């Protein structure tokens, strides 16, 4: 039996999150709330994408619910997240997507309407972070409330784990080279706290601070305080991609790498992360659903210890597909 | 003596007039209004453009002030524009620019501040409409709120007069092709009412509509009812061009066409309208200051009565410039 | 029995007509020529797409020939085209795609290497053209060298032929926003006797002439010496659209043209001529496999004798089913 | 008295050659040829600038030659680089820019026209390479054919020097994202050897490898096998920026980085090396003739031994300026 889950707030990870749990039925949708879209936009929204093509399906909207394909679904319109009914909808999970509640307090006002379990789709300062094939057997049914850490995080944990296993890593430093996302502006505009991140973002690269290194050694507790760096944000529309530079314990080539990550993706890491050998570029990896692919040419090594590893990753439908992945894991250990 | 001159509101609009009038120095700026820029975010704004480059000229805080080329300003955080000391600072004309106030009503709260004039940088409902070097010398004094159109009237408007004065246009429709503005979106996101302009605007262009043609109508009477038009925005960062496909009613080859405009572009209208032969493409009008610059070899006629007309436009210095021209008019008719 | 085709040259329009001869299977690929790409170059450039995305099957190379879906494919590389051997790889059909081979004389030495008929993939001076849906009825097995005007003409014929029969065009004027092409540079480079298309195309969109709407006249002969006009090439990825501004002979509100579009989009012109009433935009009409799409919310109309109507059209997907259609025709017709 | 300078083909880096010898007035050009431009288009190519915008000045042709500020310039067409006249125009130096002559054997067929000696504009296989600020002091008269690297090379040699001078550079890998050049393609297009610099340029990123970091150690000796990396190919127009990883083998916190760096761009490499606090992007450094700006907020460090530091540059103006400034300095020396 699939799990019931609810999802708060549709805009772009709860939209994706939606379509990815049609696409692979792992899980079943059976509400959604927002209280800035209503029925007939959340149907012209779910139907047209600009990046992942049209809806493969059928979505229209029948009675005051959102049917898509022959499912039908209820919406809420609630404000606040206490008020929001998710028993009476038989809503056992709770996708928490809006990124306003990502405190353990702030989060937990979903168990006050029904809900059973609460996810976090984004990073938390409190709630514990699990990533997919890295930390998720560590998961126990006492925990209530559940982080998935972000995109970035997903791209660089089971790589590093890999490499980890392996060789050991010392030290590194991580660049990502980051599509354009929600929060920046189309012509240079006012933002409060971050003055880069308000310039035009069709015109230039914005060098953007990010937490997700660090966040990996929150999810692999032996590389904490090992990692840490920074991001450029490139008028591109969907496809990210991730630098590692990294110093090893033990001497590796790069055939050696080469070797122990294509036997990771093969059998343990299947799914997750991914291994080519091709003359691949960022559009290749439009709409696919690994957590991260290793390039094989892209990546240097200057000698034995000192080396430059190359990923790809989509950080839209990846980051879903592993949040659907993580939800019937959950299902799975009740 | 020059006049003085406040802005409310510092996006966009407020922070190009502010520029052209320091370049031109035609009026004083001694009063800025913004609710939500400090004093220092007001300097990194000023100082740094994507698209027109840095300011030539200093730019720096001190005393609570904003000090530009050694003049200071006044610096103003009301959200209620009929609370605004506008007297105590000294400005005697105020240009409303946040595109919120636009009725005669609602614009008029500036009056109780202490300003003498008020000039909307926006299509207005019920306010008066000048376009410079069209229909600018009908204001007079007991005038007290004005309404300076928009950009693409200001484009259309004195190529529109010129061939209605020559040939006697019947009838005309008009395709503009527009750059991205700040009210669209980098992905695809939610819009209230307008849905086609919540999508992305780095990977489509959205036909939108507009009411800039039957403007021109209201400028002049005599093409009242015989105009209208739609938008195209293009993921383009300045410059937009307007096409005009009109029927004539007098016959009229090309050459007589390029003959009259580059007439009038010599002579009464310099500076408004512009002329060129030349093989020029969008970013050659970057920074450019005419209303409108007609281009020769990009149009096309059918017969004698049916022809295709192409002009280019700076939809961001022309209209600044043309604000602070007809403030100097205005200051000029005191 | 499906008939054999051979495609010379294996640029844009030559993959794309292969990429849709498999996927509709109206027709069978037999041969490629191309002097210029290896085998192994063949296989990377069919795998991958940056606009299609990868292609849905199997494509690779053994025995020095190229294995798609488990059909073998020959490969040649002359330079000359009277030197390819046609009729011993079996191909009966031949298009012509590499855009320098257009008149009669010139394509007609594919006819002594064993091709039956040619089809060229572009505007020809002197071979007849074809545009299906519109006067593909007039075809003949007489004929041997046939052309298939281009994208733009496929798109702007049926809109123009259902209009023409309906309410009788007296004369009309087409702007057309046009994607980027292989023809043009990503920076400021040199084209020789085209000043504009040499400067960049991320940058600056390109007023460009085209004969589309002339050959319009050609197609429909009714309409010869009544149609003309421009083009614009905006810095975008794949999707075009047409402005057809035009003066109709009877009185027609805009409700009786979308009646009569939508009446002749359901029955006559399936496939061909689309119909649609949501808010789309450009990106909505990747790999559509429309000749063009009538755009109801987007036209506007001043009075009952002048129109302006929008049509949606992809230029590399739908002119390259049309190729596989009329071939298909052309296989019927023997 | 100033230099003569002839320059070899009027591609992108001729140009600006030309604009940088013109603004600066230190050096003196005479002669330009090229094989594939004529005079009128030579005209229009200088006069406008999609990236740099209009030049400050009058560029026309008269006689046969091209005049720019009232100085003739003698244009000649040939296509082998022995039979152009150098010596009988005046021009003592010449500047070899085609990209195709970078070998000391194919630059040499210069001297054999008349000049005296030979700037390439582009890293070179077995001539000596100078990089302005660094090995500069190294010149002598009897060198005759010089390299000046490349831009990568100009923006990352001077921060390196600093680095390695204060505090011991062991080993370091470079990352930077590039604007687009002229060598990649608007859409997906053939590349002979390089399978992914064929893609379209406006859709994705290119991982590119570069000999740049390499050069450095042919620049600095003590530096010699202990930097290499790659490059990325963004969709942007002028700007890129340079991300350093490196070891340092004397313990530094990221303030004493900051203090050394800021006075070696005051004092000793001013006008080189550049010093930036402010919250800045790229287009902030569009036509900057720094060779590189250090960008003090955007760096991080993971502990003492282990920095990463961050530097713009401009690719188009800085280079041209360091040529102008190299001819001018070899001018001096004689």
């Given at each position: 039996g699939k799990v019931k889950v609810g999802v708060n707030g549709f805009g772009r990870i709860g939209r994706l999150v939606t379509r990815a749990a049609f696409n692979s039925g792992k899980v079943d949708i059976v509400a959604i709330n927002d209280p800035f879209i209503d029925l007939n936009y959340m149907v012209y929204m779910f139907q047209?994408?600009?990046?992942?093509?049209?809806?493969?399906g059928t979505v229209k909207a029948e009675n005051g619910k959102l049917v898509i394909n022959g499912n039908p679904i209820t919406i809420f319109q609630e404000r606040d997240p206490s008020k929001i009914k998710w028993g009476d909808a038989g809503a056992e999970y709770v996708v928490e997507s809006?990124?306003?509640?990502?405190?353990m307090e702030k989060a937990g006002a979903h168990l006050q309407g029904g809900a059973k379990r609460v996810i976090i789709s984004a990073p938390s300062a409190d709630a514990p972070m699990f990533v997919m094939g890295v930390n998720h057997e560590k998961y126990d049914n006492s925990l209530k409330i559940i982080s998935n850490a972000s995109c970035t995080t997903n791209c660089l944990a089971p790589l590093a784990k890999v490499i980890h296993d392996n060789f050991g890593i010392v030290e590194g430093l991580m660049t990502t080279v980051h599509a354009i996302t929600a929060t920046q502006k189309t012509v240079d505009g006012p933002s409060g706290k971050l003055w880069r991140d308000g310039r035009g973002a069709l015109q230039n690269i914005i060098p953007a601070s990010t937490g997700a290194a660090k966040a990996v050694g929150k999810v692999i507790?032996?590389?904490?305080?090992k990692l840490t760096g920074m991001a450029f944000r490139v008028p591109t529309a969907n496809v990210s991609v991730v630098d590692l530079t990294c110093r090893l314990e033990k001497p590796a080539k790069y055939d050696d790498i080469k070797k122990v990550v294509k036997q990771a993706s093969e059998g343990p890491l299947k799914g997750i992360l991914g291994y080519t050998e091709h003359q691949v570029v960022s559009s290749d990896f439009n709409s696919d659903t690994h957590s991260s692919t290793f390039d094989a040419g892209a990546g240097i090594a200057l000698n034995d210890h000192f080396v430059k590893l190359i990923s790809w990753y989509d950080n839209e439908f990846g980051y879903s597909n592993r949040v659907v992945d993580l939800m019937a894991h959950m299902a799975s250990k009740e």
């Amino acid at each position: 039996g699939k799990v019931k889950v609810g999802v708060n707030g549709f805009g772009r990870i709860g939209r994706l999150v939606t379509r990815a749990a049609f696409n692979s039925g792992k899980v079943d949708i059976v509400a959604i709330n927002d209280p800035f879209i209503d029925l007939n936009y959340m149907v012209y929204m779910f139907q047209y994408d600009s990046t992942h093509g049209k809806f493969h399906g059928t979505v229209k909207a029948e009675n005051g619910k959102l049917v898509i394909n022959g499912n039908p679904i209820t919406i809420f319109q609630e404000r606040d997240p206490s008020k929001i009914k998710w028993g009476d909808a038989g809503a056992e999970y709770v996708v928490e997507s809006t990124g306003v509640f990502t405190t353990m307090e702030k989060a937990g006002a979903h168990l006050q309407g029904g809900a059973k379990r609460v996810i976090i789709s984004a990073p938390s300062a409190d709630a514990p972070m699990f990533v997919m094939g890295v930390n998720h057997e560590k998961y126990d049914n006492s925990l209530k409330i559940i982080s998935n850490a972000s995109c970035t995080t997903n791209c660089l944990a089971p790589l590093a784990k890999v490499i980890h296993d392996n060789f050991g890593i010392v030290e590194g430093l991580m660049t990502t080279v980051h599509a354009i996302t929600a929060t920046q502006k189309t012509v240079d505009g006012p933002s409060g706290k971050l003055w880069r991140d308000g310039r035009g973002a069709l015109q230039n690269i914005i060098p953007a601070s990010t937490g997700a290194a660090k966040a990996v050694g929150k999810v692999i507790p032996e590389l904490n305080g090992k990692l840490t760096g920074m991001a450029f944000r490139v008028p591109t529309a969907n496809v990210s991609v991730v630098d590692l530079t990294c110093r090893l314990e033990k001497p590796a080539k790069y055939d050696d790498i080469k070797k122990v990550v294509k036997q990771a993706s093969e059998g343990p890491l299947k799914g997750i992360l991914g291994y080519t050998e091709h003359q691949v570029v960022s559009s290749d990896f439009n709409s696919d659903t690994h957590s991260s692919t290793f390039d094989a040419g892209a990546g240097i090594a200057l000698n034995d210890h000192f080396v430059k590893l190359i990923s790809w990753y989509d950080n839209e439908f990846g980051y879903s597909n592993r949040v659907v992945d993580l939800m019937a894991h959950m299902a799975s250990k009740e």
